[PDB]
From a paper:
In Gram-negative bacteria, Fe3+-siderophore complexes are recognised at the bacterial cell surface by highly selective outer-membrane TonB-dependent transporters (TBDTs). These transporters bind the Fe3+-siderophore complex and translocate it into the periplasm. The structures of pyoverdine, pyochelin, citrate and ferrichrome iron complexes bound to their respective transporters FpvA, FptA, FecA and FhuA showed that the ferric-siderophore complexes were bound inside the barrel adjacent to the plug domain, a position thought to be poised for translocation. Pseudomonas aeruginosa, a serious opportunistic pathogen, does not make enterobactin but does possess a TBTD outer-membrane protein [name], related to FepA, that binds and translocates Fe3+-enterobactin into the periplasm. [name] has the same two domains (22-stranded β-barrel and N-terminal plug) common to the TBDTs.
Author numbering: 15 to 721
The structure:
Amino acid sequence: TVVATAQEETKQAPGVSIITAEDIAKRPPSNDLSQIIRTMPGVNLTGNSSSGQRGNNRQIDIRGMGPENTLILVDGKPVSSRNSVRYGWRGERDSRGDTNWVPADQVERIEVIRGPAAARYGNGAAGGVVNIITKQAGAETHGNLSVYSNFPQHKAEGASERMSFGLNGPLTENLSYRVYGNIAKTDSDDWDINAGHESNRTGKQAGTLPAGREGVRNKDIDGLLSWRLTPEQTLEFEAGFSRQGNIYTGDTQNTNSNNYVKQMLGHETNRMYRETYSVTHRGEWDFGSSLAYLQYEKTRNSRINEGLAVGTEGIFDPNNAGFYTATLRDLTAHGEVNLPLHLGYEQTLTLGSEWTEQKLDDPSSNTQNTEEGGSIPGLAGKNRSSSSSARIFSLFAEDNIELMPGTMLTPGLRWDHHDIVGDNWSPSLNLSHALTERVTLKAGIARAYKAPNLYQLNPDYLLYSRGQGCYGQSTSCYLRGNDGLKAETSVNKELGIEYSHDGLVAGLTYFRNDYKNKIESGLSPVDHASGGKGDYANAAIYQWENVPKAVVEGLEGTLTLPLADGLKWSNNLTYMLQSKNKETGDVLSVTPRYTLNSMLDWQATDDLSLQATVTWYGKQKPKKYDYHGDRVTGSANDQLSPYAIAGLGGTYRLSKNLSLGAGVDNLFDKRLFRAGNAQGVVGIDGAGAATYNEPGRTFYTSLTASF
């Protein structure tokens, strides 16, 4: 018996779930993998912002920490592409997230690491980590061709189709390849899907609509070559090219319109190019193991020009038609060695480092002039730089120690130096303790780290308001980036007990995060500008600021029953006890109060597999207060009732080479419609928690040819 690395040991911690390729095949998503990831315990499909802005662009949220705090990996390497899309006043981004980069049918598995076992992954892992692992080459040449198509009951809702392929195996003696390609379309919902369901709209804004889901068109291709240089050294080269164009269906920040909007309904209004290049060295040695990689990610965000303020705010700019391009260049270097240490206790020490650079060039975001609200000393009113960057060097040590058989202790320390923010120390401890052969106690506590994002950190990043979004006042203000921000830290702990024997599993876990210095728009003026025009002159100057304390707290439960040899009933239950910003007393992240996922899995024959699913969501309650900090009144208090979603499907194995699947999601056709943002603006009432579309009954087919 030799001990696994701390990285691998802590994948059995209470806060880890694994989604397999088999799981994905039985219950396939339309396109974005968030659809299947979201059904793990402690995981929500949530908007980026509590405002409800861009509220249909829902993403993976871990334990109510918000999708910003979900670090997404592909084959262990970070995806930062959504950082090319401007972060607004309310933490809103016009971005679908980073779970759409890999086609579902070329995924081997997905590792969902929540809470204390995630902290080790460093910057961005305060909520957790989602690591998408691709299917890799073997010793024979293998390959596949996978098609999926779905069929909404209601034609106003967007259909999806998808075709992908894999091919891999040995070219020469030392040389092997793996390639995948993928073509996909999730159509947008129709412009008027939410008509009849919208928030009350008056005057100039009469006839406006909050938008349904934005469509997407994917083109993805990857190529990996794996070169066995010696018996102890493998070198991998990998390139990836992914293109995502939208299909625009009327989405604007505040759900207002103009004719430039109406004109672009059904068109491409944003397109994302992601280019990835990585070189990876793996060593298998007499003493242990080695892994080192370099990844360069180039993200290009091309979209139609919008305004930052004054009623060109968050909508296509009719005076400045055309597109701009923001470019993100993200370079990540990593090295580590793994050391089985024999004497004393048989443990495994991991020693490593990491370096990252992020360069952002965004010509649209830093362009707010100071004509109206007055000039701000130290900030040029015009021609401010597009460019921003930050760097983080990291050291770490982790040790996985068998204290005595059945008991493992996993301490780890990560140190990080951010070139602007300064140093961070992230202590880590996870452990597992067998109480009997059937029952285990597992605990964890660690301090995760999230660096400020480049919009929050940039003193050239300026937003302006005539008064509507100003906290504690109704007169005009500025919101300014702040390069002396502290980084966010979160002390995340979990305690879990689990019974496990002959496929019966019963478990319960408690979690709590003490979330420190969450970066958010300031509450009090730190200055006032000078000059400007009329009543707007001498605007208050707010900054991006660190919120002292926030908390989330809840329970994750699991119950898996073997009803018969070919029949399994799997259940998870998550219950949210707290999610609060302790400064404003407001909500941190809007999640269902609970989520109960149930699956009935029947191996009906050798070649036939049938599945039933039910998911019960609890109540959703919106923000209590507006941008001013004042108590919200009217339909901005609206809450979503609890509801369920049921599904059925199967897979038929024609042979070892061909499988087909069919089924239906949302069997009882429960639909919800986006009515607006949380709170209103002039002419447009709020909609509270009614900020997204739940799709109705949707039939599906799939076919996988493989060898």
